[PDB]
A paper describes a structure:
We detected additional difference electron density towards the pentameric VP1 channel in all structures.
Coxsackievirus A24 variant (CVA24v) and enterovirus 70 (EV70) are responsible for several outbreaks of a highly contagious eye disease called acute hemorrhagic conjunctivitis (AHC). As is typical for picornaviruses, the four capsid proteins (VP1-4) assemble into an icosahedral pseudo T3-capsid. CVA24v recognizes the receptor at a solvent exposed site on the virus shell by interactions with a single capsid protein VP1.
Residue numbers in the entry:
A (entry chain 4), B (entry chain 4), C (entry chain 4): 2 to 12, 24 to 69
D (entry chain 1), E (entry chain 1): 25 to 305
F (entry chain 1): 25 to 51
G (entry chain 2): 8 to 271
H (entry chain 3): 1 to 237
I (entry chain 3), J (entry chain 3): 1 to 48
The structure:
Amino acid sequence: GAQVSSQKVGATVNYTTINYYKDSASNAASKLDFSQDPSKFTEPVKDIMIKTAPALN
Amino acid sequence: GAQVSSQKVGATVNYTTINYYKDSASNAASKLDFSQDPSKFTEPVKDIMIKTAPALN
Amino acid sequence: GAQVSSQKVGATVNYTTINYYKDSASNAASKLDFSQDPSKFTEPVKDIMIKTAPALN
Amino acid sequence: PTAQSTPLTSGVNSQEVPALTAVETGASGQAVPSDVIETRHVVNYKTRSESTLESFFGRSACVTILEVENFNATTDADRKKQFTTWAITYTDTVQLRRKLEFFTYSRFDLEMTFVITERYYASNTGHARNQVYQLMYIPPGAPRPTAWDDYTWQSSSNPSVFYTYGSAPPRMSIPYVGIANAYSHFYDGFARVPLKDETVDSGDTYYGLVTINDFGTLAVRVVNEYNPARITSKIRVYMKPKHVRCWCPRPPRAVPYRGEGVDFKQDSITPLTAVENINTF
Amino acid sequence: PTAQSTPLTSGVNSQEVPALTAVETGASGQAVPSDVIETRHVVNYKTRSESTLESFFGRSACVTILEVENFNATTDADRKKQFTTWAITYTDTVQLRRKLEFFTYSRFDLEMTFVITERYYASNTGHARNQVYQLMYIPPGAPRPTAWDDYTWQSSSNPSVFYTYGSAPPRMSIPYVGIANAYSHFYDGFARVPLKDETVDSGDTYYGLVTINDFGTLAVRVVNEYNPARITSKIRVYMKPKHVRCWCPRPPRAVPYRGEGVDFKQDSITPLTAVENINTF
Amino acid sequence: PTAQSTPLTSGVNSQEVPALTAVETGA
Amino acid sequence: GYSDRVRQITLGNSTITTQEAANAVVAYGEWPSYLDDKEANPIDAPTEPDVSSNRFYTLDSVQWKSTSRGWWWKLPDALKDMGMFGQNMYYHYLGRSGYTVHVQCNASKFHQGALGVFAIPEYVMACNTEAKTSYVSYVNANPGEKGGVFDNAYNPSAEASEGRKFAALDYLLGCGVLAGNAFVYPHQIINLRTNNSATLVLPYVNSLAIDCMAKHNNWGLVILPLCKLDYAPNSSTEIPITVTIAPMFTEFNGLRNITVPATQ
Amino acid sequence: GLPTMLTPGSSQFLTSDDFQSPCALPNFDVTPPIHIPGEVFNMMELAEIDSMIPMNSVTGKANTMEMYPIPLDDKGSATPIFSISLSPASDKRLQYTMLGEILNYYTHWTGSLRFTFLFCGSMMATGKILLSYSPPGAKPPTTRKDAMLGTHIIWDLGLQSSCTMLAPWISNTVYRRCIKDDFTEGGYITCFYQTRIVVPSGTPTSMFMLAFVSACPDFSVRLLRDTNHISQRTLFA
Amino acid sequence: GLPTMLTPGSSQFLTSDDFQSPCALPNFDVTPPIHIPGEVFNMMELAE
Amino acid sequence: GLPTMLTPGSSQFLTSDDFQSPCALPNFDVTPPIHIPGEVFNMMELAE
């Protein structure tokens, strides 16, 4: 039961992984999570502010 | 001949197992047995006692 | 080229074997041979003797 | 396969009375919060995975410590330090024993592991080349060594493990070797029936498990011959029950052990510390 | 999944004014170069792969240094050098701590790694056989050792690792063991509510995370008995958070720590070096 | 491939006499 | 209208009634049975004496006083001289049996007290000398039907021969465990305001399919006063506790001449 | 010779590891299993069995059979009958129960606790008794009017000999620690006469009840550890 | 015994490595996750 | 260089082990077998 994934591009671009232990805590690093949305920190406003519009009416 | 199973959930969630030796005694721990029924210790009575009913008539 | 067999029962009951060397002499122990027939030592008589019959007539 | 969730219940005013029972029956109390209070719904994702017998017993535990030495032995008592023997059992220590003794019977394979450690006995007698240890399992009936270098150690049929000092702790598995259908942690009986008017002495005969148990002997030596420097070694033996089943639960040991049996010691049978008052938070 | 490309834009002469906003709203500035200059098209192939939490925290970092020794201990204080205990935490050191404290809450598995080093204490007291170390994790409640060779070390249920000197640094994984749904790096509260007119002393009670945190004890010893030569050892403990999630970002620590809490030191609260002039390139 | 099981038998009163043999035969 | 307070048990030519029971216990949820062909061990045709031995034998009664600390019996031992069960036991090398245990103790609506009745597998108890370990004589370990008693004191004997008997210390259940946890064993309680009997049905319990009965007791029967007897008009009063036990599904193997154990 | 490389951990002996090992007795034919009554699969099965709390382990009675029975009488006192903290692993009385003993092989616990009480007076005795569980954070209750503001049940004595009070899982943390610890304190269990015990003449005016404790089906435990209830100074042989 | 051969790097401890390791607490049931406000995924979120 | 990790037991010599080992005489042509009377397969044959 072997997972095959793309490896990080450097300067035959896949790598193989088999988990050997029965606890997820034993596993290596989580695969890259590219999730993001800074709006909750950079723009947590109740009413939408369109950039091109005035922030205050 | 490789068994693939779910590993214990921690904080690619399968692990692989191959038995290398010819005696079962050599094998690693038994997979989690969630069997249970405490009735033989907590309620080993001959006649069924319904909780909501009186225990004695 | 992997052989898969039942392992000896103790108290996922198969094990895998791959021969790594090119001479059979290198191999591990022969799989259990349950052949037997003690008649050649316990009863090597020319004429069949039925247990329930007399051995001598 | 999780522990139980709590349903959404409200109150009652009913002839159904789950809060009352009668424990004279042998039944424990069965009522749960929903039976006696208003409860919300709570989904329970938590499991009892770590309290399965396999999890509970799934540890290598120290069960004894042996000593063996390697020096030029002139006297008779010094010759007996060149090797050592041990009756194999779980009872020399208290921790694993107590856990096993939650149950009357049990059945499992064993994982034996050893941790071997050395020290110099003195500073001014030169040095000592790296030592190889032999741990031989001597099943009941097989001849036991009288010297560290006698014929018994050729081990043509006994299993032996040769360990090189500094290497990874050695380890092997043992099957369920019991001659019964399970191991007994308790045996309320004797090894033989003493008969009427027999001459055989029953003034110094023993009782229970000790009279019937015998798993054999572990013999240990240093395979090396003596260096000018005397080296004393310790062998810690570890056991892990695996593929475990157990039957007939018992109360746990409440007071210090004093033997391989269930006897207790007079100065050590007061486990509880008294409370100031029955009302004391 | 890359960082943002720049589009081809030219100028404007418009009632749309993206260059102006009002940060009173709580919103940060949102404008980008294309909004306020003429830009060319630039395809951006670059990624933020190395600033993901997993990448940011994906290092084994030293979190403490322990000392333990192995010699013939006559006095009481010398007996206490034969083993050592440590309250497990990320706060003894500053580097990882500061990185973790970018966040209020977090949740992760741990990779514990150890680096073990020895030296001789003096030259003229012979030599010493290769040592085996025992690192035992003692969860809260389990009995703690009072001597290097007492019963606690049989470790029937506590996890222990036996390390042979010279071998690869030992390593194990720990799950997310928190009793909450995440670890708290900050706790603006107390372990209990002091009530009116109670005799219990609240003149020497503590505040915040220290009053509620307890991950247990790491106990360490040398399993060997004393050589004529005294050997002192150091155990460096390393932590790597893996499978990481974090919540509620905070400003980073700007000034030296002085405890396990957020307190600062009077002689060390001037992080900035003054500039010659507000106009200074 | 096991060692031999024991069948359920009761008694006999028969001219068949399996209890007697003659080991002179070599058997 | 059938209540679980009224019950009748018939085995062989013996019948028991009770009108103030408290259900009945089937130990570990398992009724006794004969030994299956797929679990058998000795190969000789077994003897199953059926009704001659599978019947209610009634032990000598004991007296419950406010000062009483408890009573114990072992099992097959309490029945070793009981009619045909005893003969079959001693004529054979091997034997197995289940039991119906019926403990009887009636009083009045004005008495009070509670007896814990426990059936304990492999009830190994401590010896009474600290010069040795596991040091109990066969004769003291097997008192027969008269049983033994608990005490609230532990006075191990100096010389090794004087304490070749059980140290039946009540709060340690005679075996180094707290008596309050005896409820993990099959049990009932005779609480005088509620009931006058306890009934336990026991299967064979052992690490083997069948064993030597004269060597090995499978069950211990323990009766501890959890709450002491009390009766206001006369607290020196005593009420009897009577123990009646029936073997069930008895099966014996390895017939020979009779076993006659030593008596001193 | 297949190219490999050792990683940290190599050659170490972790007592909680889970690896395979060669059998010292190859081809060993184990003794065939047979059915034995009373098989256990999980330690929580045992925690769900009622065991007696040594509620009255005061001086003179601790470590005797008299530590178990809780004194009662017909005099209708306003003081509490017993009081005890919900600290099932740490408390000087609860820790010696079967549940408490099991909890001391673990670091964390969660779930509801079932306190079941058996009245052992005469049949002629009647009474009503209040059993309370007050969650933590306020004055510990020493009076009935404070006890009844918390979770409680009023027990009427009668043909049904026993009454079950629940201490439902009410906690800030998802698990509590199996040690005395203010952060995971569990609250207070207490007991009062709701009316009083009443008897006629010819009847004992003082008597006892027994208190049992067991875990409910929502109960679970984590983080196996060594217990504090057993130790040794030298080894037996 | 399958023929292998150790390569350079063997037994070293690189602090930026990414390997598996045996769990010291096997079969541990982690505390179920719940939603917490303000989750962060990338440090660049904070730089913005 | 494929990442591995040695477990307890490594380098030990258990006399009852069952592993493969390289042949000191590779490509050796064994003497062809022939039938010999009285072959034994199990020691219990002799006990009978």
